[PDB]
C-alpha cells in the first residue's frame, strides 16, 4: 500500500495473509467470507508467465494478523487448505479478466476480536455503492513504494468512471473489473502495490452499517503513478460463480 497508514487493531478482521511454507514468505492478501472460505485473486495461485502454480500443499493461510513478520502467538490462527477453486474462465494470457479464486479451509476457524468475515454484496448493495466518487478501503502488507510495512497498511480511494479507467491504459478493460484512485488533480494519493494482490477493496453500507467486499486487488502499472489507477476484480459480477462453488462443494 502506497501512501496509506497503519491499520488499527481489529480494523479489518477479515484480512488474511497467503503464506508460503518454503521459503516462508508473504504471497498475497485474501479475505475471510465465512469460517471455512477465503477469497483471493486467481493470479496469486496461477500465473504461468512467471511460472507460478500453487497447490493446496504449497500454501498456508494466516488469519487475525496485524504484524507482517511476527508470529502473533495467541492472536493469529494459521490453517490448511483443503481445496483451491479458480475461475474456469480466469484470463491470465491477456488481462487478468475474472481474477478470483476460493480457498476451502481444512477446518473452520473460530471468530474472535481479530477474526471475522466480511459480507459479499447483493445486487442491490452493488448498485447503490459501486459509483464513481464513492470511496472504498484497500488493506495489505504489500510494498510501500513501487519497502514492506511492519504492520497492516490501509488506504481509502475513490471509484473512477469506466472511461477514465480505460483511457489510462493500453490493456483492454472488461465488465469484471473496476479501477480506483485519485486523479493527478485531486491532490491526494494512494494505491495498492506488489504484495497487496488478493486483498479486499471493501465499502461500509450506509443502510445497514455492514462492511461489504466489492473488489479484490488485481493489477496496476507501477504503484501510485499519476494518471494511472489500480484495478480490482469486480466481485458482485462473479457472485454467481462463488455461490455455485460454495454450495456444490460445502
Amino acid at each position: 500500500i502506497v501512501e496509506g497508514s497503519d491499520a488499527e487493531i481489529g480494523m479489518s478482521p477479515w484480512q488474511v495473509m497467503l503464506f508460503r511454507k518454503s521459503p516462508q514468505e508473504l504471497l498475497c492478501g485474501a479475505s475471510l467470507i465465512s469460517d471455512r472460505w477465503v477469497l483471493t485473486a486467481a493470479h496469486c495461485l496461477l500465473y504461468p508467465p512467471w511460472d507460478k502454480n500453487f497447490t493446496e500443499n504449497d500454501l498456508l493461510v494466516r488469519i487475525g494478523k496485524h504484524s507482517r513478520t511476527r508470529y502473533e502467538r495467541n492472536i493469529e490462527k494459521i490453517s490448511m487448505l483443503e481445496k483451491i477453486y479458480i475461475h474456469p474462465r480466469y484470463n491470465w494470457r491477456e488481462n487478468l479478466d475474472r481474477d478470483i479464486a476460493l480457498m476451502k479451509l481444512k477446518k473452520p476457524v473460530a471468530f474472535s476480536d481479530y477474526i471475522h468475515p466480511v459480507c459479499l454484496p447483493d445486487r442491490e448493495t452493488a448498485a447503490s455503492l459501486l459509483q464513481a466518487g464513492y470511496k472504498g478501503r484497500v488493506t495489505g502488507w504489500g510494498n510501500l513504494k513501487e519497502g514492506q510495512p511492519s504492520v497492516l497498511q490501509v488506504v481509502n480511494l475513490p471509484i473512477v468512471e469506466r472511461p477514465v479507467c480505460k483511457d489510462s491504459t493500453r490493456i483492454r478493460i472488461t465488465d469484471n473489473m473496476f479501477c480506483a484512485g485519485y486523479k493527478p488533480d485531486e491532490g491526494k494519493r494512494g494505491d495498492a502495490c506488489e504484495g497487496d494482490s488478493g486483498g479486499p477493496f471493501v465499502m461500509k453500507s450506509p443502510f445497514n452499517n455492514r462492511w461489504y467486499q466489492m473488489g479484490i486487488v488485481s493489477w496496476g502499472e507501477g504503484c501510485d503513478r499519476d494518471g494511472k489507477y489500480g484495478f480490482y476484480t469486480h466481485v458482485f459480477r462473479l457472485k454467481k460463480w462463488i455461490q455455485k462453488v460454495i454450495d456444490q462443494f460445502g
Binding site: 516462508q24 514468505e25 498456508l60 513478520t69 511476527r70 494459521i78
Partner: peptide, 10 residues
C-alpha cells in the same frame, strides 16, 4: 525476515 512459526503448522 519472517519470524519462525510453529511446526505443527507445516
Amino acid at each position: 525476515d519472517f519470524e519462525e512459526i510453529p511446526e505443527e503448522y507445516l
